[PDB]
Symmetry: C4
Subunit: 364 residues, 4 copies
């Protein structure tokens, strides 16, 4: 039944109009300054970077999406086996369903079988921490796929408009998280799910010992939109309310600035509407350590293994083109390449007290 929500999610995300629906990443307001004389050759560009204790080929990850049933597991298999081939890390979808029903454990375990070397990242929802999940459930999720880290997702926006949502985010869940990090063998990433991390949220999380964030800003997959659709589907009256919140949240680019600025030493994934290597480059240049993608990976994986390899090839090339044309020989150079910030993103930062000068210093 929760496994039904799992298929509905994938089905709506893949085939319905929810990518950037009434939302914006603000990435249009970010411009990488072209360098007519790059000072490097294309083939000497090096895209390698660290991902905790491992090394990855490209500063891009597939962020968690699905699992919990068979056709969901065979998607996870396609994603993971291609991810392995390209040396890029992969998060799995929420593992709640695999703690609840043991038949679902396979659709997540397949990932480590077929991707033995890349970082794999586990996934559990924050609301579970208030509803009695603790150290052992976390250890289960982790060692079920031999995870290199665990992602705890923030989705209060989604839970609110969900027909069946559990919108409970009592502060005590953070005390519990902080305790679970005491004795977890792997690091915790806190990620949003299409609505973005603000500087108040980041600072709070940091004050409880969280050092790794994933922006998941608005302008990508619109989870409010997805739940609106589920609501329309069962004539649930919340549908119309959801419509009014379609553009709620921190746009991805704003979130990257906000997190980097408020917690300078963070490890930061810039995600939420990354659709090209150009988007990925902007996010990294803007302040992220790596870029994250979900929806476009799903869409390719559904079409098949080679479709997804073609996709990763395209992303990688686009990224390298952006690096080439900014004179960035490696990921570190990209992180400090010249940018222009315009428009609504500029106004956002100004109002939010982000000093553009001290910001430029912090991102390098």
């Amino acid at each position: 039944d929760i496994v039904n929500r799992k298929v509905e999610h994938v089905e709506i995300a893949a085939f319905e109009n929810v990518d950037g629906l009434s939302s914006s990443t603000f990435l249009n307001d970010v411009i990488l300054v072209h360098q007519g004389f790059p000072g490097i050759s294309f083939s000497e560009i090096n895209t390698k970077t660290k991902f905790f204790r491992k090394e990855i080929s490209v500063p891009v990850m597939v962020t968690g999406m699905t699992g919990g049933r068979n056709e969901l597991g065979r998607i996870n298999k396609i994603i993971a086996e291609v991810a392995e081939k390209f040396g890029i890390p992969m998060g799995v979808g929420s593992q709640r369903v695999a703690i609840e029903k043991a038949e679902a454990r396979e659709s997540f375990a397949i990932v480590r079988k077929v991707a033995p070397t890349i970082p794999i990242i586990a996934n559990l929802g924050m609301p579970q921490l208030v509803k009695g999940y603790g150290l052992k459930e976390f250890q289960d999720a982790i060692q079920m796929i031999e995870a290199d880290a665990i992602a705890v997702h923030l989705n209060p926006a989604q839970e609110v408009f969900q027909p069946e949502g559990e919108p409970e985010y009592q502060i005590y869940a953070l005390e519990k998280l902080r305790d679970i990090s005491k004795e977890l063998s792997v690091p915790i990433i806190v990620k949003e799910s299409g609505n973005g991390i603000s500087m108040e949220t980041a600072k709070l999380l940091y004050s409880y010992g969280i050092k790794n964030f994933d922006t998941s800003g608005q302008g990508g997959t619109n989870w409010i939109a997805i739940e609106m659709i589920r609501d329309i589907r069962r004539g649930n009256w919340k549908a119309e309310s959801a419509k009014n919140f379609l553009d709620w949240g921190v746009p991805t680019a704003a979130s990257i600035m906000e997190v980097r600025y408020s917690v300078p030493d963070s490890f930061l994934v810039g995600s939420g509407g990354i659709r090209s290597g150009l988007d990925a480059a902007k996010a990294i240049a803007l302040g992220a350590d790596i870029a994250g993608m979900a929806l476009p990976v799903l869409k390719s994986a559904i079409e098949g293994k080679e479709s997804l390899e073609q996709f990763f090839r395209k992303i990688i090339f686009e990224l390298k083109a952006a690096m080439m044309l900014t004179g960035s020989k490696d990921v570190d150079a990209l992180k400090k390449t010249s940018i222009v910030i315009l428009g609504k993103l500029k106004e956002w930062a100004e109002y939010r007290g982000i000093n553009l000068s001290i910001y430029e210093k912090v991102r390098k």
Copy 2:
């Protein structure tokens, strides 16, 4: 015959194209900062607030609209009985017509019969104070519905383009108002009617002892548009002039900033184009104490009692969603939640001498 204007008003407002016609609230320029970790549960959100001496369930009021005849009174009945059920305060329409003709007194009295506990707010027009209304007419309007307060409306824009308008706002009417507040048992609210309160007007009113304002800014019901339509209807030449003034006035959001800034200790209703709980939340967060609605309430009440209950349910839910997602446990927290101010609203405030730093201080 003035009872004809009363039906025409309702008929045009309800069924013709006048909501936000060529006008804007500037509320698009206000963004509530999403909090991925709210720190509260949805069901522990408390929406209660004070409304003078009484307590109300939700920081929302129905602002005055109509009365003066029978089908107008049965609308007032539907509005008031639903308002009672939800614990939200209700203003009645201008009571001039009930001071003039005694047959109209019923269409206002019904309100207190069917809504014994919520705050009810009386209504008289400012131009009447120049045309010989005084303490007794005020007391009449008040005790005719056992009002908890009286709203005196400013409508010079409307009076100008009205075919039959009385555009007289001599300063002496304020001396009279100030004298009437001497010996009125209830407080006075001064409200606009679709064209907004500026800081010059607020400061003037304050200097005469008025402490409670209702912004009624542009971007909602367009009263200049309504009178243009009445003018077109009787081939009155003023119709075309009215067309040129369709976007005249202070946008709601600007007005809320202006009044809060210029009179910090005011009790402020933020109204004019509030159409969702999101709009209500923005207005409160921006600086209002409560949000006010008229037109969408009318439209639902015309459709029937349950239609209106469905409407209030939707508004309330939307509001609580906004509170949830900003980590606002109660109305006070919402009043000091994080916002972003962009675009034309920002330019408006900057030009008008509204220091954004001292503004942030004042709203908290």
Copy 3:
């Protein structure tokens, strides 16, 4: 054949698409702050103002347009006789044609016959001052209509794209103008013709003793557009060049700011795209002493005497509405009423060194 240009001008201006073609007044960037409590009555609004030695009913003038032939003179008759009735001043079109051919003298003389009391303003082009016009031609034009002042028009943009244009503006023409003002019985106004006065131009003119300006900015009648059309009409290749300059010039609102700021004690007419009393009010509020109109007056006059009276009635009413709603009892109050300056106009002023604070001081 210069009398042919005269008819072509009127015919194109009246019946072809040239009003605000690709141009803008920037008046949308000027907002008059609505006053919910005006503090005055509509009927006590006084619209009288000085126009040199005379007094006029309304702070509006009809700026010069035509004359030089019979159907042109009967337009001038309609304009002047209605202008007399309303107590508003009128400029005539360029009188070159009446100095050249004596048969054309009637189409200008009719104006003083039918309008004995209002200020009448003569008209000669600046390029004539380089081509041997002097004190006597000026005196001729003046006493031919018993002018209360003479307007000398700047039209280099127009002359450039004119098929037959004389684009000669040698500095020496100013020495000559300065000398002609020595012994002229009436004041000189220098006006543009759809392309606006900059602060460099105003300062220069001032340094030669000119104290009265008429902005005639872009966003109204587009003279480059008119000459483009004349060019298209005789397959003259300049047509396409003219197309590229369609938005050349200082927008009216920018010009008003520029002239007022650079020459604070100037008498300033704000003209170029004034189409409503609202436009007129904005121009005056912005810094003009009076507002000027040409094209919409032509269009009405062509339709007939009563059509034009209806037009002036509409303009006057609109103006008084703007005054009413800003609490402006008279023209002086309007000149210092509260405004907001946004958008492109704001950027224009900032770049041009117009300090917004010292500007606010100067306009009062």
Copy 4:
């Protein structure tokens, strides 16, 4: 093969939709302030200016485009013979092809035969300097057309998306360039090719002794677009990546500011999307010494000799009109005429540390 790319380039540029495709020059953000009193006559406007050791009639050049085959040479012949007639300098296309195959030497040599007096500018690509071109190849290209200077083009963006591109820009190529300037009889100009020169690139080039730049910014011919088309044409997968980079680069206007600001004493050609004399005037006023055009010259030359003479006539007239209407008697006056900078260009400059005050000083 390489001579095929040469024809394809011309064919796509001339007949396909690639001029300003998804790109912008930002020239809309530059406004020349109109002067109602120019202070000059149109016929006394002098458009002469220096181009290294020679004098040219107009501050405009034809920047390099083509050559390498016969129908390409007869285009070069039309361009050069008209350029001679008008006294405007002409760059040739890349001469790589004429170093490689001797049959191609004629299509470049024709230029000096038919244009004996104007400056002719040679052309070689930067990537050739890493691939073993040196002093002798440069001297070949130079004396093959008796060049007055040599342009070395930067095209890394193009090389990246080219199906057959050589994206190699190792720093060592600059050491080589700097050495080649040791013993070249003529000056070197470094030009981009549709993607613009940034201040980092300019400063770097300057630090290696380069003093002459050609902005070739985005908003004109879109070379990424051209290669996308070549890619689509051979089902090369890069096509879709190129689509994501269609608006990559420094807009022309931004580039002119950037180069002028970062290297004040530079000789600067402002090119990339110059389509009218108005565009040319803006570029010069903005900070360029001369304006450069390519695509519109190609398009006319393809139509024939007289078509191209008509084109240069139109450009020249437009330029003089702009000069007239800003009171610019000569090129120097235009270089210091009054401008307004708005919009996205303003934001670009502000973020990039271009102080608008010190900028105004530098451009005069």
